[PDB]
Structure 1
Amino acid sequence: IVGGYTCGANTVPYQVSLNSGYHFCGGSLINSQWVVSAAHCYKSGIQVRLGEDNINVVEGNEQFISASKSIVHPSYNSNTLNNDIMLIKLKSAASLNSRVASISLPTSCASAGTQCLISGWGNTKSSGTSYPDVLKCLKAPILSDSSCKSAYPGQITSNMFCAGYLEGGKDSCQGDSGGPVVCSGKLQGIVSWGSGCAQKNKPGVYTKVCNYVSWIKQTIASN
């Protein structure tokens, strides 16, 4: 996250870190047994880490649980990143508490202008590499589809939305992929892609979760 702040230990209780020997993507806990992340974060051998703040220090509130199965969206296209969402089932149910909580799925889609909270352990430099050990947060509004489509001609589909600042300076970045974009208490997006990080007129692009609620509900109930 570039231009964000330190969230605070466990202030984003639904945030997860996907680890395969090191942190490689974020995710969101939707209930005691399931996590939603991005399809492009798919890997074999994932361990989900909940109640994390510093990913390099075991501070006492973590739960490390291996995944039993991963389900990438049936129509995920890795070339365009359309339908970039994937579900991860935990081998054991997580113990929800103040530090580990699930986030609600939306009942409707959010409007442009709505302020959201984006979080993760990704790069914090636009021009440079600096990976933080503690969770960074960023408040950013959803942008109108017109400004999103003008920035990425012929690349935005109905399953994506842009959030951020066109002036640049604030944005999600690599290492943040798969993490949450929560607006008005609902999980509305998943960190998916962008053009570099925090560049002027290149906002981040997020998977539009409101379009997948029936798929999510049906899939977890049958697995």
Structure 2
Amino acid sequence: IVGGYTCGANTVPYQVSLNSGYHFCGGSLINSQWVVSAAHCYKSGIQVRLGEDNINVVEGNEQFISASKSIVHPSYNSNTLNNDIMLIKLKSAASLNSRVASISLPTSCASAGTQCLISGWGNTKSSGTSYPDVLKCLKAPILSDSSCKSAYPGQITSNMFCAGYLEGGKDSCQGDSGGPVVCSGKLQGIVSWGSGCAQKNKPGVYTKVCNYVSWIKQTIASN
């Protein structure tokens, strides 16, 4: 997260770190047994880390639970990043309390202009590299479909939305992938892609979670 702020420990209690020996992506806890992340975050050997603030120190609220199964969306296209969503089933159920809690799926899509909370442990620089140990946060508005399409002509599908600031300075970045975009208490986005980070006229692009609730529910119903 470039241009954000330190969230404060366990104030984003649905935020997960995906670990394969190291943090490589975020995700969102949607119930005691399932995490939503980006399909482009797929890898084998994932451990889900819940209750994290500093990802390099055991602070006392963590739950570390291995994935038993990962399910990339059937129509995920890694070339276009269309349908950039994946479900991760936990080997054992998370214990839900104030420091670890699920985030609700949407019933309806979010509106443009809605201020959302984006979070993660990604790069905090738009040029150069600096990775934070504690969870970073960013408040960012959903942008119009037309502004999004103007920013990335020929690249935005109906399963994507832009959020952020056309002036630059504030964005998600490398290592935030797969993490939440929460608007009015619903998981509306997943950190997907952009063109650099925090550049003028290049806002972040997010998977539009409201288009996947049927697939999520059906999948959870049978796995």
In the superposition, the TM-score normalised over structure 2's length comes to 1.00
Question: 1:93, 1:117 → 2: CA distance?
Answer: 26
Q: Residue 118 of structure 1: CA displacement?
A: 0.1
In the TM superposition, what whole-angstrom CA distance separates every residue of 1:46-99 from its partner, at most 9, and x where no partner exists? 000000000000000000000000000000000000000000000000000100
> Runs of 5+ in structure 2 lacking a partner?
none
In the TM superposition, what whole-angstrom CA distance separates every residue of 1:161-207 from its partner, at most 9, and x where no partner exists? 00000000000001000000000000000000000000000000000
The match for 1:65 is 65
> Runs of 5+ in structure 1 lacking a partner?
none
Q: Residue 27 of structure 1: CA displacement?
A: 0.2
Q: Residue 132 of structure 1: CA displacement?
A: 0.2
The match for 1:132 is 132
Task: Give the percent of matched residue pairs that are identical in Structure 1 and Structure 2.
Answer: 100
Secondary structure of the 1:162 match is strand
Query: Please, what is the CA RMSD of the aligned residues?
Result: 0.3
Question: 1:221, 1:176 → 2: CA distance?
Answer: 28
The match for 1:80 is 80
In the TM superposition, what whole-angstrom CA distance separates every residue of 1:127-172 from its partner, at most 9, and x where no partner exists? 0100000000000000001110001001000000000000000000
Question: 1:88, 1:174 → 2: CA distance?
Answer: 21
Corresponding pairs, count: 223
The match for 1:99 is 99
Question: 1:23, 1:71 → 2: CA distance?
Answer: 19
Question: 1:113, 1:49 → 2: CA distance?
Answer: 32
Instruction: Flag as ranges the 4+ runs of structure 1 deviating above 4 A.
Output: none
Secondary structure of the 2:178 match is coil
Q: Residue 111 of structure 1: CA displacement?
A: 0.9
In the TM superposition, what whole-angstrom CA distance separates every residue of 1:98-142 from its partner, at most 9, and x where no partner exists? 000000000100111000000000000000100000000000000
Question: 2:52, 2:30 → 1: CA distance?
Answer: 16
In the superposition, the TM-score normalised over structure 1's length comes to 1.00
Question: 2:70, 2:53 → 1: CA distance?
Answer: 24
Secondary structure of the 2:218 match is helix
Q: Residue 12 of structure 1: CA displacement?
A: 0.2
Secondary structure of the 1:128 match is coil
In the TM superposition, what whole-angstrom CA distance separates every residue of 1:13-64 from its partner, at most 9, and x where no partner exists? 0000000000000000000000000000000000000000000000000000
Question: 1:202, 1:170 → 2: CA distance?
Answer: 10
